C-alpha cells in the first residue's frame, strides 16, 4: 500500500549524460550512439544570449572548440550542426550505454521524470508535469541546461524534454529532442513570462480514481453531471476545461472502478464547492494534479522495466 509520486529509474539516462564546454560555458549533453545533443546556447557567453545570431556564431566554431567529456574521458567531436534550438555534435565513439530510445513531443498535462545534472554528472531525479501553460515547475540551478526529461516503456526510453531556461516566476522552459520549444518561449535572455496556468483536470480525475482503487472512496456520491455543467463549475476554480477526449482517456480507469467519468466529475464538483471537511484523499489535504491516467495504471499494476 501507500501512494507516492514516483520517478522512473534513471540508470538508462544516467549512462547518456555528458558535459559540453565552449570556452567559459559548460552545460550538459545527451549522448546517444555517436551524437551528443545539447542546448545551442552553449556557444554563447554571459552577454551573447541577449540577442544572438546562432547561425552566425556557429559558423565561427570549429569541432575542436567543443570540449565533450563523458566521465573521465574526452570525446573527440568530428562534426557539428544546429537543429532548431539544439546543437548536434558528432563524436568518434558510439555510446556503449545507449539504451533503446525514441524522441517524443509530449502534450500539456502529461508527466515525465527529470534527471537534474551538472557538469555532466547526474545529481537527482524527480517526476513533474508539463503545465497547461507549457512550463514545468522544476528544480534547477546554474549549469543545469541540457538536463533531460523522459518516460520509460518496457525497455525503451522516450526522451521528451531538454532544459534551456528559467523564467522570472522561477518556472522552467525547454525543448523536445528536436530542439522545438514547448510554449512560445525563445532561447535568448530577453523579457519573457509564463502565462496564467490552470489545474490539470484530467490528472485530478485520474488521481481520484487512484484513490478509489486504493480504498479511499468517501467522496463518491449518487449523482452525475453533464460535461458542460461540470466545466461551468470547474472553470471558476481555475481548472482546465474537460473535453470529451479527456473523458475517453479516463475510460480504462472508469471501467476498472465501474465509476462513470461524469459520476466522478459530480464528486469533484462537490469537493471543489465544499472543500474536504477535514478528511484526506490518499493522505493528501489537496487535489493532486501531477499524476496522469497512465501514471495511475502503471503504479497500481506494479509495472516494472527491463
Amino acid at each position: 500500500s501507500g501512494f507516492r509520486k514516483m520517478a522512473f529509474p534513471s540508470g538508462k539516462v544516467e549512462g547518456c549524460m555528458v558535459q559540453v564546454t565552449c570556452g567559459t560555458t559548460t552545460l550538459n549533453g545527451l549522448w546517444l550512439d555517436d551524437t551528443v545533443y545539447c542546448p545551442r546556447h552553449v556557444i554563447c557567453t554571459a552577454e551573447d544570449m541577449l540577442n544572438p545570431n546562432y547561425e552566425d556564431l556557429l559558423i565561427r566554431k570549429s569541432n575542436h572548440s567543443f570540449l565533450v567529456q563523458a566521465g573521465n574521458v574526452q570525446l573527440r567531436v568530428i562534426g557539428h550542426s544546429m537543429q532548431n534550438c539544439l546543437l548536434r555534435l558528432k563524436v568518434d565513439t558510439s555510446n556503449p550505454k545507449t539504451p533503446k530510445y525514441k524522441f517524443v513531443r509530449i502534450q500539456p498535462g502529461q508527466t515525465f521524470s527529470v534527471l537534474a545534472c551538472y557538469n555532466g554528472s547526474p545529481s537527482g531525479v524527480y517526476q513533474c508535469a508539463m503545465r497547461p501553460n507549457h512550463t514545468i515547475k522544476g528544480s534547477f540551478l546554474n549549469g543545469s541546461c541540457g538536463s533531460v526529461g523522459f518516460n520509460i516503456d518496457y525497455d525503451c526510453v522516450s526522451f521528451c524534454y531538454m532544459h534551456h531556461m528559467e523564467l522570472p516566476t522561477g518556472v522552467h522552459a525547454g525543448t523536445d529532442l528536436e530542439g522545438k520549444f514547448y510554449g512560445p518561449f525563445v532561447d535568448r535572455q530577453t523579457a519573457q513570462a509564463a502565462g496564467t496556468d490552470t489545474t490539470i483536470t484530467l490528472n485530478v480525475l485520474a488521481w481520484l480514481y487512484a484513490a478509489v482503487i486504493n480504498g479511499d472512496r468517501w467522496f463518491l456520491n449518487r449523482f452525475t453531471t453533464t460535461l458542460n455543467d461540470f466545466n461551468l463549475v470547474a472553470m471558476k476554480y481555475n481548472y482546465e476545461p474537460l473535453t470529451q477526449d479527456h473523458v475517453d482517456i479516463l475510460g480504462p480507469l472508469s471501467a476498472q472502478t465501474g465509476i462513470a467519468v461524469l459520476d466522478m466529475c459530480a464528486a469533484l464538483k462537490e469537493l471543489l464547492q465544499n472543500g474536504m471537511n477535514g478528511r484526506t484523499i490518499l493522505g493528501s489535504t489537496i487535489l493532486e494534479d501531477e499524476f496522469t491516467p497512465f501514471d495511475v495504471v502503471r503504479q497500481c499494476s506494479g509495472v516494472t522495466f527491463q
Partner: peptide, 4 residues
C-alpha cells in the same frame, strides 16, 4: 529570462 535566464538561459540555464
Amino acid at each position: 529570462a535566464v538561459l540555464x
